[PDB]
Amino acid sequence: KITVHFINRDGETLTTKGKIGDSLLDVVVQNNLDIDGFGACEGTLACSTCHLIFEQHIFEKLEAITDEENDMLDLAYGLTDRSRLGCQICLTKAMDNMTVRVPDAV
């Protein structure tokens, strides 16, 4: 179990624990996080509601992104250079105590 911090759109910081090997969507869903409309296609790589923004140093070590995730992510809202589809990212001991931000929205 590792700690993960989610900075919601409201500006609030949600600190939770997730099991190694789990997807960030599994963490949100299973821990019943506040984030709205997160993980709609349930990891089918059909949407981008699981869009998460990472810290440069964590972003750099993530599994190489596939064109499948990339093509969908490129059309997502509030994109950044450190953006990834949460459902495709699984927790690693290295991600312990990291902070992921949820894309902005009025």
In this structure, what token pair is assigned to residue 8?
């919601």
43: left (phi over 0), alpha (psi -120 to 50) or beta: left
The binder of its own copies chosen from 78, 90, 96, 98 (CB under 8 A): 78
Rounded to 5, what percent of the chain is helix, strand, coil? 25, 25, 55
CB closer to its own copies, 43 vs 79: 79
Residue 3 Cβ, how far from ligand FES at the closest point, in Å?
22
Interaction pattern, residues 33-72, with ligand FES; x per rule: CB under 6 A: ------xxxxxxxxxxxx---------------------x
Contact residues for its own copies, defined by CB under 8 A: 9-12, 53, 55-56, 78-82, 103-106
